[PDB]
Amino acid sequence: VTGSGKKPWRQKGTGRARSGSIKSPIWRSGGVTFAARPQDHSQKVNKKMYRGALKSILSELVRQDRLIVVEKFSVEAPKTKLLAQKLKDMALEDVLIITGELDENLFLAARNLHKVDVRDATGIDPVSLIAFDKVVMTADAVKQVEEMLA
Amino acid sequence: AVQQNKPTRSKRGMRRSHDALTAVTSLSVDKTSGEKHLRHHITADGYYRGRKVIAK
Amino acid sequence: METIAKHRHARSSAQKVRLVADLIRGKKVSQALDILTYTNKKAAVLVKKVLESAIANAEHNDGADIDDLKVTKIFVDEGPSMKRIMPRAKGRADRILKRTSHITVVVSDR
Amino acid sequence: MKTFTAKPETVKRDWYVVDATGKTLGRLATELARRLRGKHKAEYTPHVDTGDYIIVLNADKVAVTGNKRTDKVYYHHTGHIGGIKQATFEEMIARRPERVIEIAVKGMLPKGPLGRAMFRKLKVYAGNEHNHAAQQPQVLDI
Amino acid sequence: MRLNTLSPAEGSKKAGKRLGRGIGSGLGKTGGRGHKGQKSRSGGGVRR
Amino acid sequence: MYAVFQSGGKQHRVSEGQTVRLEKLDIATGETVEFAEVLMIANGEEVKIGVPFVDGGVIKAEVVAHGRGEKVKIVKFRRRKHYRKQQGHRQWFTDVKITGISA
Amino acid sequence: ARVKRGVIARARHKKILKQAKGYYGARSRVYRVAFQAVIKAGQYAYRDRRQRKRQFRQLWIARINAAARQNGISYSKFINGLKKASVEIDRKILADIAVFDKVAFTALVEKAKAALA
RNA sequence: CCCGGCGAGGGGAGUGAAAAAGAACCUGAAACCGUGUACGUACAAGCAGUGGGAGCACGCUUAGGCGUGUGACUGCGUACC
RNA sequence: GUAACGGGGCUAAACCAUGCACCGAAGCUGCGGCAGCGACGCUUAUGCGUUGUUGGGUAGGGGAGCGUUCUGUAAGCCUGCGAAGGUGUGCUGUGAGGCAUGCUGGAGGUAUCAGAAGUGCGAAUGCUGACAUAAGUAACGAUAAAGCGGGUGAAAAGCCC
Lengths: 150, 56, 110, 142, 48, 103, 117
Ligand SMILES: [Mg+2]
Ligand SMILES: [Mg+2]
Ligand SMILES: [Mg+2]
Ligand SMILES: [Mg+2]
Ligand SMILES: [Mg+2]
Ligand SMILES: [Mg+2]
Ligand SMILES: [Mg+2]
Ligand SMILES: [Mg+2]
Ligand SMILES: [Mg+2]
Ligand SMILES: [Mg+2]
Ligand SMILES: [Mg+2]
Ligand SMILES: [Mg+2]
Ligand SMILES: [Mg+2]
Ligand SMILES: [Mg+2]
Ligand SMILES: [Mg+2]
Ligand SMILES: [Mg+2]
Ligand SMILES: [Mg+2]
Ligand SMILES: [Mg+2]
Ligand SMILES: [Mg+2]
Ligand SMILES: [Mg+2]
Ligand SMILES: [Mg+2]
Ligand SMILES: [Mg+2]
Ligand SMILES: [Mg+2]
Ligand SMILES: [Mg+2]
Ligand SMILES: [Mg+2]
Ligand SMILES: [Mg+2]
Ligand SMILES: [Mg+2]
Ligand SMILES: [Mg+2]
Ligand SMILES: [Mg+2]
Ligand SMILES: [Mg+2]
Fold this sequence. Notes:
part of a larger assembly; 7 chains; C: CATH 3.90.470.10; binds magnesium ion; Large ribosomal subunit protein uL15 (chain E); ribosome; 50S ribosomal protein L4
């Protein structure tokens, strides 16, 4: 707190409470007693605990029929309108699409769809597998994830 | 010299029980001009007991 | 009909203005004006002007009947106090209060 | 159901005459306080004067035991420093005889308003005559 | 298995003590430090 | 016509048509209770005093109501000792309608 | 995550102040005074839940003694007679009978006098 | 437009969804200060409550010893940290 | 100031003995209810027709919870057919508290399960602001001194002449 170190008043003889700093946390405009600093909130996840949770999540999507598997997930041109029809024909609204290879047309076509997210097999994270209602994984993506996790 | 305790709202009102003002018990009326005035005082137009002993 | 008149931010404490207002509570307005005319207080000058204004409002904005009117409700409320510094001996500053009042008069024919 | 409480608007108080001739002051005073309080009544409610009115005749002839006629001292203070005043039993009997039984009974009653109120129903007389014949008071032997 | 149906294992997340937060807590007033010594004092305690 | 009976650790002096509130009973609202251990019967002139009980005395009562009584706060406080404890309480009751007294 | 305390503080104060209705002065208006008057009332009440039982019994007995004394016997002998007569009518009900049914009480007194004779 | 000193301030009118948003202006708590109504209080002694409890007022109930406010009288009772 | 039974008063209402009755506590019992610690038959993620016992408590240790703001769940759910906040009322929970609802308010609030804390104030001669009290009290600052007439003005002891 910006200000001086001067005693606001003398220790004794005034009937006032003893003070030492205009910046005391007791005082209005004073300092915060345990003022926050920047801090890193990140945690260590053990390598095996993360893979172990990914395997658990995927198993639970299979049990809950939230995992859809397809040979391919192709949009021809980069248009939401073509993809939104595909997902309406596949009966899908909120869905994480997991391809093996980044298709430029598919990432773009899905960017403006808030409930759709298209990732590579390497882009999976545990939250997005839980967060979306359905997970659609290409056959080749199943291969990658199986080799990643095993 | 000074109080050891704050006196209450109630003690304050009890002290003020004699602070009410008395109103004029009656105004008097002039026999000639009909003005109301304080008894034994002149009227605001200058009359006392019916006589006009002021200029105004 | 009831008819209000108020004088807000009147330069007097409510305690003083109250002494006078208590003299005319529930009284014929003719009788109150004569109690206020011969009451030797500054607050009566303030109160009488408010009562006069209430009468006039009751005439011009409501119906009629000076003689039917009566002082139904009269109360003084504390208004905002002005704060001033009064130098006392030995550099001690006392903060004195210039207390205002909100005078309100209500007058009714019924 | 909630237990009965007497109501002083509906409470019935009867009138009694008592003679004090020959009777021990304290022994007599206790029965009056009992009756003045309403303890003898099943409708006794201790915040309610359920008691009865009593007339005491011949207060001048109440008896005391031992040497108490000469040696029982009634003390009172005036509220002025040094104002501790004395009176024996026989000087009181001589000057204000009705006070001897009234002081004894006041001591035996509750302290407070109701106790002060119960005491009003005691009418003490130094002689054999009272002027409350209109109240139709019954004789009571203590 | 959704973002609002994930609990921790029972016993894995103990509360955490909060000192000087009243009578009911059991750590109010002196907050477990007892009364009037070096150990009570802020930054109070003899060295190892 | 009144009778004295014990139900819930406590004695009640009741008459026909009196709702009496007594401690919780394990009886439903569509049911009748028999307080057969009655201590007194008075007809106005005939008064039968149970030596322990009125041999043939029986009180037939219908169960009208179960409910929780009026909330009562329990406050424990030890001044200067950093101790205070607050507890609430509602006492269950059974209200019974006295339908008949019989010697 | 800064937390303003005003809404929860106002409630905590209002709860006490509502409990202090009817109290004189600062006791119904001021939280510092009010909180001490509510806690004291609680302590007294708790004390009074027990005290009431002692007071009511004290009343019943004085009422029973008067009736019993009226009907010819002290309370002490009367309760002994009802004991030796196996009568289990409690003091609450004897005192109700003494007031509202004076002939029933007379019967209970003769029964006590009998079991003492 | 009206009272008022060509005042302060206020009452109407009009604006506006709202002026119970009028510039001393969103919301508008508390202390504190008042007006009004109900109940109590001028023979009464103390942490001012608590338990009991009349009476009065106001609602309820189709009568029903229950509800709200007040609280005479009475038992107990010397605040908090 | 009685003031060396607490008082009244007591010749027992004192004392000694001999007894029988009563009062007397939050002790014991009785009725109803909560919780902890054990131990038990059916049977089982046990909870009970059950059973036994415990349950005053500072420092202090242990255990389980309430609520507050923020993050996710949430581009969802509630909300101008009235959010938060404020103020009453009713109901409810062992408690912190919670639910509903009138009035005000006039636009935001947020279940659930998790997550993170500037997370709960009556005290610190605490800090800031606001408002009391004393009190309509003291005082209005040199004891060089004012008085009248006229004027102006809503009003003149104080201004003008
Ligand atoms: Mg700062
Ligand atoms: Mg790594
Ligand atoms: Mg100077
Ligand atoms: Mg006493
Ligand atoms: Mg402890
Ligand atoms: Mg300390
Ligand atoms: Mg020490
Ligand atoms: Mg230590
Ligand atoms: Mg104007
Ligand atoms: Mg505003
Ligand atoms: Mg305002
Ligand atoms: Mg009186
Ligand atoms: Mg006094
Ligand atoms: Mg006392
Ligand atoms: Mg002496
Ligand atoms: Mg003996
Ligand atoms: Mg007991
Ligand atoms: Mg016990
Ligand atoms: Mg039990
Ligand atoms: Mg314990
Ligand atoms: Mg115990
Ligand atoms: Mg918010
Ligand atoms: Mg609201
Ligand atoms: Mg504070
Ligand atoms: Mg503290
Ligand atoms: Mg003074
Ligand atoms: Mg003076
Ligand atoms: Mg002076
Ligand atoms: Mg001067
Ligand atoms: Mg002049």
